[PDB]
Ligand binder design. Structure first.
Ligand SMILES: Nc1ncnc2c1ncn2[C@@H]1O[C@H](COP(=O)(O)OP(=O)(O)OP(O)(O)=S)[C@@H](O)[C@H]1O
Ligand SMILES: [Mg+2]
Lengths: 210, 187
């Protein structure tokens, strides 16, 4: 079973699954605590349990592994990562790690990982021999990122005006200088929808602050 | 041996232009095939279009170079044939042009130029009269093969491809895009 599969489930499932596994009062506490309790209960049975997420390196190799759907929130369900396998696999911050996870021992309250079977959606040996980002030589934008959806949507006029106004391509560095109450949120929403529709290959990330 | 150099330079230019037209046609055909497909492939189609104009510009450049080299080799052969025909029959020629071509060694610039102009247009009436009576002009025997493989005129598929009149700005923009395309193809 997948920890990510648990985290993608809604909150009410704690009644359906947590109570069915013998837990007593998972109704009243924070969701990550419910996830921790259910996955501890399942781990006590002994079946193999999967895990995955984005790696974080602390100031002293006290590595952690967070989940994307939880907005990388520091919670009990975070996966511990000792410096030993960090050195062995030459890992660093931002690495997507997937594989086995281990139930915590005495004195530990975080689920460590037994062995990784996927790094950055690739084999660990293929991920190890990859050069650093900053060593890559930049260039100007070459491939055009057309925002015209082409589905004839009633809101597609925004994307069309965007295409006529400012061309967007791979590798640009863009700014949207707007006042409050101007339409930034749904302009970015239309941009994201057009990117998801026209260009399913490129990885799309949206980041929201305060 | 300069005529042979011009000849095989023109042959190389023609081969290069044919090759350029080859990948241009291939790119156009595959772009049409992808457009006919059900998949969207927006970036695929956009960069394929860009490749299409890059290949079109390369074809234009190759055709222009081929036409220029063909004209150059024709001019070189004309100069050589007319020069040694001078070396053959120039005594009789200048005898026919005697009443105004004398004194050229010491005449003034204006007099020399006007005498040359009179000689030129007189040759014009003579030549147009010979073309008017109308025999079939035959190629020079010494260079007949070299001047007949290149053809009387450059191929029409090259002439119709040299009417775009690209501006210099577009010229170096397309050169930069072609260099970037070659670099991407190498990778
Ligand atoms: N393309 C559009 N079609 C229809 N209504 C639009 C469109 N763009 C903006 N609006 C309206 O204009 C307002 C824009 O609201 P938002 O995009 O939420 O503002 P904002 O850019 O997020 O700035 P904030 O968050 O309020 S400071 C709303 O009242 C929308 O209904
Ligand atoms: Mg907003």
């Amino acid at each position: 079973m997948n920890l990510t599969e648990l985290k993608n489930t809604p909150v009410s499932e704690l009644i359906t699954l947590g109570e069915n596994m013998g837990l007593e009062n998972l109704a009243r506490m924070r969701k990550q605590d419910i996830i921790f309790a259910i996955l501890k209960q399942h781990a006590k049975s002994g079946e193999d349990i999967f895990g995955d997420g984005v790696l974080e390196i602390l100031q002293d190799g006290f590595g952690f592994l967070r989940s994307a759907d939880s907005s990388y929130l520091a919670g009990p369900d975070d996966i511990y990562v000792s410096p030993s396998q960090i050195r062995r696999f030459n890992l660093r911050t931002g690495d997507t790690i997937s594989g086995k996870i281990r139930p915590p021992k005495e004195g530990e309250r975080y689920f460590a990982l037994l062995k990784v079977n996927e790094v950055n959606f690739d084999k660990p040996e293929n991920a190890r021999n990859k050069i650093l980002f900053e060593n890559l030589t930049p260039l100007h934008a070459n491939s055009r990122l057309r925002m015209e959806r082409g589905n004839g949507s009633t809101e597609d006029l925004t994307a069309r005006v965007l295409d006529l106004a400012s061309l967007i391509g791979r590798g640009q560095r863009g700014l949207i200088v707007a006042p409050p109450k101007a339409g930034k949120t749904m302009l970015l929403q239309n941009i994201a929808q057009s990117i998801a529709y026209n260009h399913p290959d490129c990885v799309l990330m949206v980041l929201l602050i305060d | 041996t300069a005529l042979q150099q011009a000849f095989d330079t023109c042959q190389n230019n023609k081969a290069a232009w044919l090759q350029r037209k080859n990948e241009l046609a291939a790119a156009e055909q595959e772009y049409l095939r992808l457009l006919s497909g059900e998949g969207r492939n927006v970036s695929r189609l956009d960069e394929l279009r860009n490749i299409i104009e890059v290949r079109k510009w390369q074809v234009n450049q190759a055709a222009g170079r081929y036409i220029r080299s063909h004209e150059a080799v024709q001019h070189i052969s004309i100069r050589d044939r007319l020069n040694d025909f001078m070396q053959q029959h120039g005594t009789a020629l200048a005898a026919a042009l005697a009443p105004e071509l004398m004194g050229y060694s010491e005449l003034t610039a204006i007099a020399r130029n006007c005498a040359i102009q009179r000689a030129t247009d007189a040759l014009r009436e003579a030549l147009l009269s010979w073309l008017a009576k109308g025999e079939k002009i035959n190629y020079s025997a010494q260079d007949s093969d070299i001047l007949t493989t290149i053809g009387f005129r450059p191929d029409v598929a090259s002439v119709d491809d040299s009417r775009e009149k690209f501006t210099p700005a577009q010229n170096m923009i397309f050169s930069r895009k072609s260099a970037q395309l070659a670099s991407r193809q190498s990778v």
